[PDB]
């Protein structure tokens, strides 16, 4: 029965119940249903008008908190002598909820999510005075042509949604829409992306938002700067389906749900909850 | 034009602010909403589902032996079988539950709990248990005469294989905190203990060491507020291939 | 009253006399794809009796040292009967499932089965950063044994696995769990040979224990597809 629930439910008073046939404490877990034993039906209650709002447990309010999804300190200098592995004043980033575990465990509570990403790009700068650098954050789709240089002609943004912003400005906030080809983001994808057997397991590219190619629009300055670009994603307009067990073991990788666990309890493989002495030993005991 | 002035709090990025922001892809047509089964619109739907306690959170219980409690035939009268730390917000048997893992995204919680214990002995195994929720203030009761003064349920083993120990919301305060102090009046919940009402009595062909799977859900009274990040997960370094998401 | 249950699908039928109930997963009964949710434009073949019936999988020996068993759907059924031939000949499928897991023992045995149907069970390998390959996931009709079912082989918790559609086979109380699964995918239809929506998971939370003569207690699984559609006809692949 679907009903609008704004506050937690009231408790009716109850009296002495001595009745054959009606055993409300006795329930069947084997049916899979959670026990419907009301607190009135189990113990003797008073009338309580419960005014506690349930609004902070809304899945919209649960997940619409702008959490960190990307962070790169990258050097901002002459890159004529640097190696061809570091960021030559730009970084591509396939937009990925899996990189940071606080938002990842929250989004992996559910199986399917339908949200709009409210990407806030916080750029901060340190010296190896601070410059007022202008940054471009060109939104490239999944697999499309990502730039090769800082001053390459992919940054002209004929159709890719670039956002130009400065360090001295407030952080650039754009709204990435619901960009899955399916009706929800498959947070877990039990299956393979490709038709051949070489495809990566669990990684649905429909779950992938796209690339976030971020460069610094200014040319290279005679001193080098370490520019750290933090990206904050706020899921919004959130519809969520099929909740899951929250992940207890520590994450190993962003590409999959591999597990190793801690060496000892808590959150270990053989023992998730921290150990105690016996089953009849109370750890936090009020001894006076 | 319009005479304005910047307030304190201008140009600051609060993470939990709720403001309309600039659309990156204009006139975007999102994928049409399909009826996917099992929509959660409120996290208290997830909390009210039963989920197994690790009452056997000891050593020498490796992995799955932590979810069940081995009870045996006893030669002594009215013996303690197990007691359960009731700190949802702290580490203990309630932590890795649906009522526990979601409430560790919060700080203040209210409402009544719901402990369900499914006996998993033989059909020939007959026994009776008492499940005493003691409201806090004193020590964990070790004798049954001490514990049955509190809120309890006496459970016969027959056709129905589960009781519900309703843990009533007995608190002075409207909610209860996390503090890292399990012995605080604002945080401590009480003690659920279990004693042999009579005994676990099996015949010669049943196993003498039967089991108990302990569930906990929350009720419709339940409530959560003051959202925080979970202490159940951590991150020491970058995850593997997270540098390869930039390459 | 609810202990007896006859499930008539197609020419198949299953009675059970110690049943708990049957779990209509997430309160949702399977149906065909409606026109407002439909995507593939061609007329889907709906055989309605050649596939909508109980395909009984191979039984697995429920033992003392067993960790668990899992069957990924429809990967368990992509080579069985007319569901398998419709899978191999079509690009798309949309089918709910009616899993009926059979496992009985005497009134002297004890044990508990977490018969839980996990949607989108992205497995994880243990103590490595390499993703599970094709052979580690797509076991087929045989199914797979859990390696660490206490964490459900994906770092999550078995203790919270009752958030999924589940029933229990407590050998004290009942001997058959029945979970009626709808179409659980973000897409309306999907390619069956490279994706599995539901994963039936069967876990010994309480192991098989008795003191009598140790007869073999197996766990038999009878998965019936429900409300099958199949678009995109072509040659078979297998």
């Amino acid at each position: 029965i679907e009903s609008i629930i704004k506050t937690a439910t009231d408790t009716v008073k109850s009296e002495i119940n001595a009745e054959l046939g009606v055993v409300p404490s006795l329930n069947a877990v084997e049916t899979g249903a959670t026990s419907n034993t009301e607190p009135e039906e189990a113990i003797q209650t008073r009338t309580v008008i419960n005014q506690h709002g349930v609004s902070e447990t809304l899945v919209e309010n649960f997940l619409s908190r702008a959490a960190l999804v990307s962070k790169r300190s990258f050097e901002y200098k002459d890159h004529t002598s640097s190696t061809a592995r570091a960021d030559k004043n730009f970084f591509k980033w396939t937009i990925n909820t899996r990189s940071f575990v606080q938002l990842r465990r929250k989004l992996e509570l559910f199986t399917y999510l339908r949200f709009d990403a409210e990407i806030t790009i916080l750029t901060t700068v340190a010296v190896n005075g601070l410059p007022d650098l202008t940054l471009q954050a060109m939104f490239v789709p999944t697999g499309a042509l990502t730039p090769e240089k800082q001053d390459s002609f992919h940054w002209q943004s004929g159709s890719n949604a670039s956002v130009f912003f400065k360090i001295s400005d407030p952080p650039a906030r754009i709204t990435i829409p619901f960009m899955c080809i399916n009706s929800a983001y498959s947070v877990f994808y039990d299956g393979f992306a490709g038709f051949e057997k070489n495809g990566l397991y669990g990684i649905n590219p429909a779950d992938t938002i796209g690339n976030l190619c971020v460069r610094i629009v200014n040319e290279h300055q005679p001193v080098g700067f370490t520019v750290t670009v933090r990206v904050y994603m706020k899921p919004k307009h959130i519809k969520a389906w099929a909740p899951r067990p929250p992940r207890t073991l520590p994450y190993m990788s962003i590409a999959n749900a591999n597990y190793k666990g801690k060496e000892r309890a808590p959150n270990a493989l053989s023992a998730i909850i921290g150990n105690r002495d016996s089953v009849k030993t109370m750890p936090h005991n009020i001894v006076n | 034009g319009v005479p304005t002035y910047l307030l304190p709090g201008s140009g600051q990025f609060l993470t939990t602010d709720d403001h309309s922001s600039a659309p990156a892809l204009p006139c975007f047509n999102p994928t049409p909403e399909m009826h996917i089964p099992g929509q959660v619109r409120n996290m208290l739907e997830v909390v009210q589902v039963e989920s197994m306690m690790e009452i056997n959170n000891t050593e020498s219980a490796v992995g799955m032996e932590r979810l069940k409690v081995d009870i045996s035939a006893l030669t002594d009268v009215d013996q303690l079988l197990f007691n359960i730390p009731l700190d949802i917000q702290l580490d203990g048997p309630l932590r890795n539950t649906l009522v526990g893992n979601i409430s560790r995204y919060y700080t203040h919680w209210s409402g009544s709990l719901e402990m369900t214990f499914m006996f998993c002995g033989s059909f020939m195994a007959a026994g009776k248990l008492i499940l005493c929720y003691t409201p806090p203030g004193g020590s964990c009761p070790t004798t049954r005469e001490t514990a049955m003064l509190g809120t309890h349920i006496v459970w016969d083993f027959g056709l129905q294989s589960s009781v519900t120990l309703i843990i009533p919301w007995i608190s002075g305060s409207h909610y209860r905190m996390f503090n890292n102090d399990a012995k605080s009046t604002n945080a401590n919940v009480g003690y659920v203990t279990c004693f042999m009402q009579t005994n676990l009595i099996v015949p010669s062909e049943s196993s003498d060491t039967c089991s108990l799977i302990g569930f906990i859900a929350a009720k419709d009274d339940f409530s959560l507020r003051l959202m925080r990040d979970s202490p159940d997960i951590g991150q020491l370094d970058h995850l593997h291939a997270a540098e390869a998401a930039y390459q | 009253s609810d202990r007896v249950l006859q499930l008539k699908l197609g020419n198949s039928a299953i009675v059970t006399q110690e049943a708990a109930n049957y779990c209509c997963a997430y309160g949702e009964w399977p149906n065909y794809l409606p026109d407002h949710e439909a995507v593939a434009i061609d007329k889907p073949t709906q055989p309605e009796t050649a596939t909508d019936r109980f395909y009984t999988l191979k039984s697995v020996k429920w033992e003392t040292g067993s960790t668990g068993w899992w069957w990924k759907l429809p990967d368990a059924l992509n080579n069985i009967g007319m569901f398998g031939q419709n899978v191999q000949h079509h690009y798309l499928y949309r089918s709910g499932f009616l899993i009926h897991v059979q496992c009985n023992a005497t009134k002297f045995h004890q044990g508990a089965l977490l018969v839980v149907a996990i949607p989108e069970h992205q497995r994880g390998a243990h103590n490595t950063n390499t993703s599970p390959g094709f052979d580690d996931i797509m076991k087929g009709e045989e199914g797979g044994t859990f390696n660490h079912p206490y964490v459900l082989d994906d770092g999550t918790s078995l203790a919270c696995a009752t958030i999924f559609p589940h029933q229990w086979i407590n050998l004290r109380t009942n001997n058959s769990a029945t979970i009626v699964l709808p179409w659980m995918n973000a897409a309306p239809m999907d390619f069956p040979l490279r994706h599995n929506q539901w994963t039936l998971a069967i876990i010994p939370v309480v192991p098989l224990g008795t003191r009598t003569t140790s007869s073999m207690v197996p766990i038999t699984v009878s998965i019936a597809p429900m409300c099958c559609e199949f678009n995109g006809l072509r040659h078979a692949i297998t």
Binding site: T34, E60, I238 | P23, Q48 | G27
Partner: peptide, 30 residues
């Protein structure tokens, strides 16, 4: 609340959907 954009996804978060149905989880049986 404010939403001076031309796209309905660009609005603020819809923190008003208080309709819940726990009985598809707590009582998923028929």
């Amino acid at each position: 609340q404010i939403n001076f954009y031309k796209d309905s996804y660009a609005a603020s978060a819809s923190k008003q959907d208080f309709s819940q149905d726990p009985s598809k989880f707590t009582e998923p049986v028929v």
